Design a binder for this molecule. Structure first.
Ligand SMILES: Nc1nc(-c2ccccc2)nc2[nH]nc(Nc3ccc(C(F)(F)F)cc3)c12
Ligand SMILES: Nc1nc(-c2ccccc2)nc2[nH]nc(Nc3ccc(C(F)(F)F)cc3)c12
Lengths: 40, 252, 273, 230, 230, 57, 40, 216, 58, 40
């Protein structure tokens, strides 16, 4: 229950989210597949 | 067979053709694009120079030899003197760019060596004098001539690549969009970078976005012969240039 | 439940997941099952403990000020006498917090403050007194207090809180940034000039927080230290970066020592265990 | 009014106690959030990015030399490198896994090592990379190293080898701090054959070492690092 | 009774903490509210009303002269006036936007300037009014001013020109206090042609300057002003 | 959501929103779009922070 | 939830209202239109 | 049920520059264990494997055994320092910022209360360990090798105040959501040290004797 | 806010008072519980096991 | 009512369970019955 109507007052509520490491691990135009040559 | 090692980039009225290249990188997985109505806050019809600006520009090459420490360029500063882009930069009060950054370095099968090419946003630099000293404008905005980490100074930023230029270690610089150039495998590296900032649009003169580092990790050597000298050439283009607000030409 | 590994038997294929090229700048999501024989097993882990929210959303000391309760002396500025004190808002004063925030380029969050005061009487006291402490926000353009009790402290429009020594204040402050996120770094200047401050300091116009003992002098000099803690809430961050290896010298600046110690422990031989 | 009873802990300040509180700025309207690239949700999204390992952190190696592992001609069966596998105070101390792990007490899951060859295109070698599980010593000879988990790496067009070090612990979690009870064992690399360069040439060539986490990587219980000295 | 735990902040006094409280006068019946004209709901309803700007606040201008901008005969290409566009300590300091903005930290949105001609009905002139975006200097010449946002104003039956100064900032909000990082640039006015009065006459004529907010005007984070000295 | 500005292109009309008379005592609700070319954009603001209630309360 | 039955005790509840600047910006008998002459 | 686990003594005095602050008791470090006080240890010893969440209560009391002019209510800080975390060196160095380390502030005369979830590496806490840290002739034996719980640090956060004030901080522990496996016989002989199951060279037989097998 | 009255016992510490409390480690994920033989639920499960009596304690 | 969303914070809730002394009193492969010979 929220007791204040000013949203900053809200406790640190939130959900866990699925991770998306592709933004940092596979930022490539052409999709690389495991097992395929990296250098074609 | 459409090999991944061969690419052509066509942008504006200029092209790049490579035969020995690694897959290009799209920084953070996001292709560059125009400002949406939702994001926009500046109430002016924007200007879109299109292909008059969004073309490749080539910066003066530099020699990579044994003992070289590496080089640093700032964007958009590096292009401030080039083409209509450079002129627009001083007439428009604010703007936003994405880039295609292409680094070239030729060699034969008898050469060894490795460059690390990294694009670092907001690369705030440490001063050579340390303490409370700030780096002066004159030394963070050199234009086409990048900051040669091999050159001595006392008023410029610190030049020791181990700590980049800000106290972090180079080993962890790989968190940023990056690509390597191994002379034995590839002679090019290509990174596409979307506009990254806390605001829709910003000054293109008092503030840099992107800092392009090219730091040799493994010195150039050869199986035989005297110390080799290999030129390194950098070619950069704006992607979706969008500008706003007209003023008299800014004076720096 | 998410599996950590799946059963995998010996392979003899032309497909080679163990061989790639880091040249591309990509890190492929390979698994132990791509190298050795494995057995099916669960993770029993959700990763909730490593969320950005937990990393940054813990209270940390940000700043400590010292104010005193003494009979005012007419020969010195009240601020110099520590009758009141002004803390320019920042999170960069204490490294334990700064270091975490430094790991992201852009950070957005709401704040929670906690203010704790403790008194001390390092003198020939006859008794102790529980003082009331006032803390006041002074955003840019607001008047700065000059005397320990001038009109500024009326707090007509400036958010403020009163609390006693031994007690604490707690309140929330919503994201106050001008931009969509707070910048941790700024590769630029306040304007196009040869001589001007460089770096994130030019964006720090958060204002100041003023502290005061609201009681009158009481014969003896009482020292009060006020510790301000900060916790971020509803935290978002963009563009991760490498953590700093070298010691910090000053606020905002990324400067480091002229001859820094290489922060890598060394050994005698590349093969020494 | 309503009868109440206070319990122990009343009026305590607790670092991690997430609660509601009054706003100091009652009707403030926060600045809109524009789209910004590179959003981070979890530290484990970062742990999976490869960073360099200062494996050649020997004395007298000031500069970027710490990230270069030398290989030499006509050497066979000898050790290229080796180290004790800590995510605390070992060679991995300053890598991103190092830096992230220094904020946690408990570590579990698989690690990934990767090596990249930077020598002449005309050169070749085969290298043995091996992991020695806890309880073992050394290895001091290739004959010992080969009995652990290992990969034989052929230098060729694809310049990078990836070795995923499996979780072999009999304990569900290991410490990030060095601790004998949870030692992770050793990592080593040996010349399977030898380094061969074109005829009548003599050079030293180098490899670059990398480290990242496997998708199956776990961290628990946050703590302060030892990277801050003031 | 019900177990409870007190949290940090218990018994604090907070200026902006809106809460319920006991009434000191339990069954009091307030005086009825008769209709009163001019009800105000929001400060931004006030910000949109035009007030005079003391543009001629030069030294030796004591009195209402500060609100009069002189124009003179046979002058061409010269500057009529100019100022740095602050809502803090500039010429706009004492206008209603000034006074309202001094109660807030953050300012955003568009401003409106307006000028009214008070000279002879038989006179005429064309004036250039221009806004110079941030980062520029001066302007010092009409040739510079014309490159910014501008309007050419023909004096005639309609005595007032309105120039809406667009929001051109690359930063979502600017400070009300002077701050280099968020400078709003400059406002200037030049003689497009010249002031012309009937033959054989010689006079100085004046304009009155006005300022108000555009519907798109935003203010955030309240603060105390610097207009109080005791 | 309330718009701050709407797209507006160059005009060449007999309608002149930039020209008026303050003599009347009225302040007309003109916009940037009545002077210069503009681009559609949202306010992302409700003005709640400036309500009389916050000013005085 | 209100805990007191004396209305003054109520917290500072209220809604935001649409602004009506016409009371202060266009108090004229004869309606003026943008683009029309102010002086007919 | 709550039980006292450990008591520390910290003082508030003007620092002396000739001695390590820890030695002056300006702050104090408690290595976490439940084996310090026998009244609790004895119960836990009755099971081989124990799993639970913890609840802590920290109570501080001051004393002024000197020519005081007045009393002061001090604020006490307690901080977790898990393995690998920096250990405080000075009574007020950067470590105490508690940027990432859970901590609590409370006043003398008041108490802290908080929960700590099961922190074991294994599925249960071992009460006993018939083994060593590694395969070596010389190494510590027994449950101590598994105790890497870390430490809890205590500090008076106030500055010196003319006189020396002594504060004792008592830490109580209560287990919650408790599971246990493999019951065992309770210890009959006195405990000597923490972790170790050692006993006296010539222990007293803990069986009351009588004159005759048939004496009532 | 809500009027309240404190009762005797406020702020007492009581050994056996089972109550809720804030966690010091907000998003910690405990180690999974593997099956372990010999689980004990009640002390009276132990009381029923035969042990020796030192009857000849003379 | 739980007030905290971190499960360790939960009070010592639980049910009583039927006892199962057979784990400690009759751990035998071959079932013994009362009244039957223990030694067959
Ligand atoms: N003040 C700032 N402004 C900007 C910024 C301004 C314009 C455009 C973009 C960014 N970036 C910042 N990064 N760090 C800042 N300092 C800071 C922020 C919050 C707090 C605290 F504690 F109030 F939350 C204390 C200090 C900061
Ligand atoms: N630290 C330990 N680890 C292990 C263990 C480790 C690896 C594998 C298997 C078991 N078993 C233990 N048994 N008793 C331990 N000491 C202890 C436990 C909890 C607490 C307190 F108070 F924090 F709850 C204080 C002290 C303990």
């Amino acid at each position: 229950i929220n007791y204040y109507k000013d949203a900053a007052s809200s406790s640190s509520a939130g959900q866990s989210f699925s991770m998306d490491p592709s933004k940092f691990t596979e930022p490539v135009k052409d999709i690389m597949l495991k097992g395929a040559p990296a250098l074609n | 067979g459409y090999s991944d090692r061969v690419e052509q980039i066509t942008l504006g009225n200029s092209t790049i053709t490579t035969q020995e290249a690694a897959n290009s990188i799209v920084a953070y997985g996001e292709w560059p694009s125009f400002l949406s109505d939702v994001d926009a806050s500046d109430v002016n019809k924007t200007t879109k120079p299109d292909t008059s600006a969004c073309r490749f520009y080539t910066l003066d090459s530099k020699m990579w030899t044994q003992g070289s420490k590496g080089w640093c360029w700032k964007l958009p500063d590096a292009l401030k003197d080039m083409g209509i882009f450079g002129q627009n930069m001083f007439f428009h009060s604010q703007g936003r760019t994405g880039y295609t950054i292409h680094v070239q370095c030729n060699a034969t099968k008898f050469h060894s060596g490795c460059l690390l090419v990294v694009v670092i946003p907001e690369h705030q630099l440490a001063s050579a004098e340390g303490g409370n000293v700030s780096v002066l404008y004159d030394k963070t905005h050199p234009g086409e001539k990048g900051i040669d980490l091999s050159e001595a100074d006392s008023t410029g930023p610190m030049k020791d690549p181990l700590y980049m230029m800000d106290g972090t270690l180079i080993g962890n610089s790989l968190i940023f969009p990056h690509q390597f150039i191994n002379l034995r495998t590839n002679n090019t590296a290509t990174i596409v970078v979307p506009y990254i900032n806390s605001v829709p649009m910003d000054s293109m003169t008092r503030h840099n976005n992107l800092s392009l580092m090219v730091i040799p990790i493994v010195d150039i050597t050869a199986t035989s012969g005297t110390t080799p000298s290999i030129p390194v050439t950098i070619t950069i283009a704006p992607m979706f240039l969008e500008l706003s607000g007209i003023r008299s030409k800014a004076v720096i | 439940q998410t599996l950590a590994s799946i059963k995998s038997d010996s392979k003899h294929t032309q497909k080679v997941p163990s061989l790639t090229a880091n040249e591309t700048g990509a890190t492929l999501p390979t698994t132990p099952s791509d190298s050795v024989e494995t057995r099916t097993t669960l993770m029993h882990y959700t990763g909730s403990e490593t969320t950005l929210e937990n990393f940054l959303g813990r209270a940390a000391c940000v700043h400590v000020v010292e104010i005193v309760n003494k009979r005012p002396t007419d020969t010195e500025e009240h601020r110099m006498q520590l009758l009141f004190n002004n803390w320019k808002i920042n999170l960069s004063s204490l490294v334990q917090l700064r270091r975490k925030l430094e790991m992201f380029t852009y950070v957005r969050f709401d704040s929670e403050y906690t203010i704790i005061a403790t008194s001390s009487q390092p003198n020939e006291a006859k008794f102790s007194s529980n003082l009331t402490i006032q803390a006041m926000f002074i955003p840019p353009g607001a008047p700065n207090p000059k005397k320990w009790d001038d009109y500024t402290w009326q707090s007509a429009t400036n958010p403020s809180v009163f609390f006693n020594v031994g007690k604490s204040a707690r309140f929330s402050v919503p994201y106050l940034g001008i931009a969509s996120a707070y910048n941790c770094f700024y590769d630029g200047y306040s304007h196009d000039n040869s001589t001007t401050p460089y770096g994130i300091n030019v964006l720090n116009h958060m204002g100041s927080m003023a502290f005061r003992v609201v009681n009158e002098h009481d014969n003896h000099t009482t020292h009060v230290k006020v510790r301000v803690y900060h916790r971020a809430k509803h935290i978002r961050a963009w563009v991760p970066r490498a953590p700093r290896a070298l010691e910090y010298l000053h606020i905002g600046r990324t400067n480091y020592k002229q001859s820094p110690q290489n922060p890598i422990k060394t050994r005698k031989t590349i093969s020494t265990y | 009014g309503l009868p109440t009873v206070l319990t122990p802990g009343s009026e305590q300040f607790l670092t991690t106690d997430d609660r509601q509180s009054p706003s100091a700025m009652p009707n403030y309207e926060p600045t809109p959030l524009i789209h910004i690239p590179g959003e981070v949700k979890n530290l484990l999204e970062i742990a999976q990015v490869d960073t360099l390992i200062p494996l050649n952190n020997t004395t007298n190696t000031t500069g970027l030399g710490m990230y270069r592992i030398p290989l030499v001609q006509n050497m066979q069966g000898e050790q290229v490198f080796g180290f004790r596998l800590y995510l605390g105070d070992g060679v991995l101390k300053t890598t991103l896994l190092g830096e992230l792990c220094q904020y946690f007490t408990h570590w579990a899951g698989s690690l990934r090592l990767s090596f990249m060859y930077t020598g002449p295109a005309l050169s070749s070698a085969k290298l043995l990379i091996a992991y020695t599980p806890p309880g073992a010593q050394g290895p001091t000879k290739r004959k010992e190293a080969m009995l652990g988990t290992h990969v034989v790496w052929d230098i060729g067009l694809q310049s990078t080898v990836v070795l995923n070090i499996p979780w072999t612990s009999g304990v569900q979690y290991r410490y990030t701090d060095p601790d004998t009870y949870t030692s992770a064992g050793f990592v080593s690399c040996w010349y399977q054959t030898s380094l061969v360069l074109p005829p009548q040439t003599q050079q030293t060539v180098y490899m670059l070492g990398f480290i990242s986490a496997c998708p199956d990587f776990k961290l628990r219980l946050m703590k302060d690092t030892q990277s801050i000295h003031q």
